[PDB]
Amino acid sequence: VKLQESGGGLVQPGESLTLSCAVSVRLSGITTMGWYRQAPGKQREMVASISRGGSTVYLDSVKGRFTVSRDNTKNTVKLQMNSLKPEDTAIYYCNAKILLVASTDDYWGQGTQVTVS
Amino acid sequence: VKLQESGGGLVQPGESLTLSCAVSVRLSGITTMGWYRQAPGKQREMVASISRGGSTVYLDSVKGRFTVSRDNTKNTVKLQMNSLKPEDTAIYYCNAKILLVASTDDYWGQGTQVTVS
Amino acid sequence: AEEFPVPNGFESAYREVDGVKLHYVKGGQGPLVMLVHGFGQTWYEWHQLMPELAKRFTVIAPDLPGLGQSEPPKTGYSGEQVAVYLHKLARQFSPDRPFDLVAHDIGIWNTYPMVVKNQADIARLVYMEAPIPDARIYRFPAFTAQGESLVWHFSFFAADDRLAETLIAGKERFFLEHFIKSHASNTEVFSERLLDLYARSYAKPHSLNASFEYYRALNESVRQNAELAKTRLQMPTMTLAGGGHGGMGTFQLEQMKAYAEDVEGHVLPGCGHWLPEECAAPMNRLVIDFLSR
Amino acid sequence: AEEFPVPNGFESAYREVDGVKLHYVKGGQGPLVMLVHGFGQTWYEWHQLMPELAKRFTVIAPDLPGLGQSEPPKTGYSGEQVAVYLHKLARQFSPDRPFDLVAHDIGIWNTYPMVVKNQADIARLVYMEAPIPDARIYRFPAFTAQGESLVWHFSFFAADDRLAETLIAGKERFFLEHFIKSHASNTEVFSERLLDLYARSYAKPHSLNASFEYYRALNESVRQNAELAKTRLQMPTMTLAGGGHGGMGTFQLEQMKAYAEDVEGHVLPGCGHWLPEECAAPMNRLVIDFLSR
């Protein structure tokens, strides 16, 4: 299973960005898709996840600003990022969890840089 | 938790024996009590077990001859052995299994010799 | 009507806490001890301990939000959300002094965050018969060589489509007896009458839903506690667990040593999950001695 | 009436086997291949594969005892007991030549003993999407960081007081959709109509009971297989597993390497537990190629 993120870049505070993640297998075969971000020297944090039934989990500081969604037609996952702030600068990763009988599989994209300056 | 077996001895073919096992805790706190026997150089075998709800499992070759039971009044477990045969010679052990949330506890008595000659 | 008989010298009362009307039973005099029940039960599980503690303490035993005679929470059912209500309730009765806390089963889930976040408010702590929610719970086996495990209900209750409410509605009395007795060593104490009383309480449609919402929030509580547990508990702590069929065994104390600096533990042989009812005499003795030192 | 539509060129028929009237669907010409369904389903899960296999083989797809249109077993529901019926059924149609066997889910449980005990009768073997019953299954987690696990039903179904029949009776359609879709990656193929058909079949009171009796006998099958597995399987074997949500992943092949000397395995990405329906095209191709070499 392979994931590839896109849509990052450099923007000013208050602007918006849309990240997207391409998935090489059927998206409903992925139990949870989670967006993670990593800033240098900081602890990684889970920004927004979405189960295949649609249950979401959000980092408190992005609630009301970021929205994660699944597009089963295009087989992509999206992170809509509004009202971006300097605190949001980080590399953003998509993480696919696959629940199996005996274990949970774990896959990651390579990430995309988001810089708010 | 401590178990002590009693009631073994030397008998002739066709005779009966009653083994009993004393239990240091409340018997309904024991998920499964199993009688095992061990003859020299042989593989151990599970003769008769009884769950605390009363479900039994018997070794095929003792079905109809042996009967395991719980006595919650006296806090003992019994193995009634009828129609004893030379093949039944072995040391007989009682094994207590205690189902917990994260593991299963395992306790054993010291055993009692049964000899059919 | 009252769902359960109130002991002499105690009062059944209600207090509004952050917009939620909580039921509790209170009695005695002295420093406050709050007793917090768990799943399948109400304040009434404590009714044998309460008169004994009331000789030296003011004793309050609330119904968890949505259970017993308490209104459902307005915020949510995660441990951090529910602990706000219980903390504020205890502080209404002990505003100027720390209080003691005894919690059983999901009462632990619903109090741990306020203990770790208001350590000065908790004098002594007793936790019995449930894991604090953390990733250790993901290792418990689904099925065992002894048959039905003690933990398959975690997934059943947590299922996001309310499978548990759907299947158990109309069968609440059958299911509760199955659940309680399968987690008990002393099954004799769970008479037809006692099970009838507990079943009527949790069969109220909002209480049946509230029961499983605590499990639907369990992974959120795990995530919350992974952050909270970076600060260790400093007050004196005691754990109790059953060592018979249905109990937590040594896991209770072993887990707690990762959370608490000052902890002693006991495992009660021949007792299962329902310590206040299965093994009242030794459990009451241990709780009273620990809190009275 | 027939519970499921029969493909053109196939016949729905019955055969008495050791006093038990078994239903099967049969068609084609050539050497025999028997296809054995699993829990929640019937022979009909194979209806897309059967016409393709029938171009080169005689194909028989029975309903497991007590499920579909087959009578319950007279002996019991352990794997060794049920395999007697299936072995004798296959041998009625292939008395003078070995036959091929494809089994899914508890079809594996119900055929493994007759494979290991009559190895000369089995030419080639395909097993998909379930553990052979052994002590490995006692390690599967009850609850996960992703929420509801895929295996909590083992304990639920095995409970000795028939808890599962009691709770699911009257809610058979709701529960089966929950179970099937939660073990599926391709949920789209499980339409309202397909789920209605499977639900009506297993909701027959004796079929609902039979469904869970297979799990009530699972620990007995484990004990049986601990003895049987001292003899390794020598015929060519192929395993298939889903690699998407709901599947067995690599466990299928890894377990089978402890049972079979000559084994190849495949994991189908983006497919869950229900391989014949979720991923018919690649699964059918793999089965036909393996059996046709």
DSSP per residue, chain C: --SSPPPTTEEEEEEEETTEEEEEEEEE-SSEEEEE--TT--GGGGTTHHHHHTTTSEEEEEPPTTSTTPPPPSS-SSHHHHHHHHHHHHHHH-TTS-EEEEEETHHHHTTHHHHHH-GGGEEEEEEESS--SSGGGGGSBSEETTEE-S-THHHHHH-TT-HHHHHHTT-HHHHHHHHHHHT-S--TTS-HHHHHHHHHHHHSHHHHHHHHHHHHTHHHHHHHHHHHTTS-B-S-EEEEEE-STTS-TTHHHHHHTTTBSSEEEEEETT--S-HHHHSHHHHHHHHHHHHH-
- Asked if the Cβ–Cβ distance from D152 to C154 is below 8 Å, we say yes
CATH code, B3-112: 2.60.40.10
Please check whether residue C2 lies inside any domain of the structure. Answer: no
Whether B22 contacts chain C with CB within 8 A = no
Task: Locate the chain C residue with the closest alpha carbon to B1.
Answer: C269
Q: Top-level CATH class of A3-109? A: mainly beta
Total tally of structural domains belonging to chain C = 1
- Asked if the Cβ–Cβ distance from A53 to C160 is below 8 Å, we say yes
Is residue D98 a contact partner of residue D122, using CB atoms and an 8 Å limit? yes
Whether B53 contacts chain D with CB within 8 A = yes
Closest CA to D271 of A32, A96, A75, A26: A26
Please check whether residue D1 lies inside any domain of the structure. Answer: no
Contacts of C152 in chain D (CB under 8 A): 142, 152-156
Of the candidates D145, D154, D222, the beta carbon closest to that of C142 is on D154
Of the candidates C131, C244, C251, the beta carbon closest to that of B98 is on C244
Structural domain harbouring C77: 10-292
Domain ranges, ordered by start, for chain B: 3-112
Please check whether residue C132 lies inside any domain of the structure. Answer: yes
- Asked if the Cβ–Cβ distance from C138 to D143 is below 8 Å, we say yes
Please check whether residue C93 lies inside any domain of the structure. Answer: yes
- Resolution of this model in Å is 1.9
- Asked if the Cβ–Cβ distance from D160 to C147 is below 8 Å, we say yes
Tokens of B13: 């073919």
Residues ≥6 apart with Cβ < 8 Å to C230: none
Domain harbouring C123, CATH code: 3.40.50.1820
* CA atoms of B1 and B109, how far apart (whole Å): 10
Angle CA C109–C245–D211, to nearest 5: 90
Whether B64 contacts chain D with CB within 8 A = no
Which technique was used to obtain these atomic coordinates? X-ray
Please check whether residue D282 lies inside any domain of the structure. Answer: yes
- Asked if the Cβ–Cβ distance from D149 to A99 is below 8 Å, we say yes
Q: 């908790």: which residue's tokens?
A: C122
Whether B52 contacts chain C with CB within 8 A = yes
* CA atoms of B34 and A17, how far apart (whole Å): 65
Task: Determine the distance from the C-alpha atom of residue D88 to the mean position of all C-alpha atoms in its chain, rounded to a whole number.
Answer: 17
Please check whether residue C72 lies inside any domain of the structure. Answer: yes
Do B and A share at least 3 CB pairs under 8 Å? no
Please check whether residue D158 lies inside any domain of the structure. Answer: yes
Q: What is the 3-state secondary structure (H, E, C) of chain D?
A: CCCCCCCCCEEEEEEEECCEEEEEEEEECCCEEEEECCCCCCHHHHCCHHHHHCCCCEEEEECCCCCCCCCCCCCCCCHHHHHHHHHHHHHHHCCCCCEEEEEECHHHHCCHHHHHHCHHHEEEEEEECCCCCCHHHHHCECEECCEECCCCHHHHHHCCCCHHHHHHCCCHHHHHHHHHHHCCCCCCCCCHHHHHHHHHHHHCHHHHHHHHHHHHCHHHHHHHHHHHCCCCECCCEEEEEECCCCCCCCHHHHHHCCCECCEEEEEECCCCCCHHHHCHHHHHHHHHHHHHC
Contacts of D253 in chain A (CB under 8 A): none
Please check whether residue D269 lies inside any domain of the structure. Answer: yes
Task: Locate the chain C residue with the closest alpha carbon to D149.
Answer: C155
Tokens of D11: 């016949």
Tokens of D65: 């005892």
Of the candidates C249, C251, C269, the beta carbon closest to that of B25 is on C269
Q: Mutate one of C137, C148, C150 to test the D interface: name it (highest D CB count within 10 A).
A: C148
Is residue C37 a contact partner of residue C201, using CB atoms and an 8 Å limit? no
Subunits adjacent to chain B (3 or more Cβ pairs under 8 Å): C, D
Contacts of C220 in chain A (CB under 8 A): 57
Of the candidates C143, C155, C160, the beta carbon closest to that of D143 is on C155
